[PDB]
Amino acid sequence: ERPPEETLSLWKGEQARLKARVVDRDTEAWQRDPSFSGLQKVGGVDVSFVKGDSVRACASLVVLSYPELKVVYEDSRMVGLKAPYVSGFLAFREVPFLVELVQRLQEKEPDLMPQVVLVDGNGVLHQRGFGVACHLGVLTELPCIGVAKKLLQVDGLENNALHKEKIVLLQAGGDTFPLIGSSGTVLGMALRSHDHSTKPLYVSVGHRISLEVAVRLTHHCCRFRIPEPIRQADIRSREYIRRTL
């Protein structure tokens, strides 16, 4: 249920090569705006699978209007995944299919191309600084934000008692604390999504966005704990699985 080490070594080399293309600063005019004026379309992606099958899956791309957060585009399609899940290699399972959804959008409704994509999974908060959100960003050149629902324990980061103390100090929606690697680098932020949630999101740069803008936009997408673009992709892909099977 795990690729051989020689395969993982090839994948690590690919991740290191592609990381040279990540842009971890703002490159879009709306990103530097106090209310994100100019931002109209926010994307979300996720993949759901079946109980008893890690091959058959449903990949979903949704585009939401901003700031209303209403779904203006959905593409949910059944795919056959090839690689198993290995922590640190999520993109090699999901990202070829996500790229195909973006290309299908360009062909079908090019005027609904999202201005930024929230990805279910980390960006630079990653064993090699190149998570699935960076990987989608570099292959599509779209701005991308990584949003993970639990902490990837890399570069000295750990979900220990000290980390849980900082989570307790998050007290209102929008509060954050930085995830500082042993390198002295800020890899991402823990974010309290809303007043009535206590388990934080872990937000990090995917591509063509700064961390502080990525955190603020994620917060603006949080009707519930999971940001609405990811939440809709998650709900619709699982619903799609249920109906057809």
Which residues participate in the annotated binding site for Mg(2+)?
46, 120
We find the least distance from the C-beta atom of residue 120 to Mn ion, in angstroms, to be 3
Q: Is the peptide bond before 84 cis (omega within 30 degrees of 0)?
A: no
Question: Residue 75 or residue 120: which is nearer to Mn ion going by CB?
Answer: 120
Contacts of 151 (CB under 8 A, 6+ apart): 157, 158, 159, 163, 179, 190, 202
We find the least distance from the C-beta atom of residue 145 to Mn ion, in angstroms, to be 14
120, 203, 206, 240: which one contacts Mn ion (CB under 5 A)?
A: 120
Residue tagged 């639990």 (tokens): 150
Residue 228 binds Mn ion (CB under 5 A): no
Question: Residue 86 or residue 180: which is nearer to Mn ion going by CB?
Answer: 86
Within the chain, residue ranges assigned H as helices are 5-19, 91-108, 132-140, 161-169, 211-220, 228-244
Residue 234 binds Mn ion (CB under 5 A): yes
Give the span between the Cα atoms of 73 and 228, in whole angstroms: 13
Question: Residue 75 or residue 234: which is nearer to Mn ion going by CB?
Answer: 234
Binding mask 28-47 for Mn ion (x = CB under 5 A): ------------------x-
The span of 95-103, 117-125, 187-195, 221-229 binding Mn ion (CB under 5 A) equals: 117-125
**Roughly how many angstroms between the first and final C-alpha of the chain, as a whole number?**
25
- The SS3 of residue 136 is helix
Question: Residue 170 or residue 228: which is nearer to Mn ion going by CB?
Answer: 228
Residues binding Mn ion (CB under 5 A): 46, 120, 234
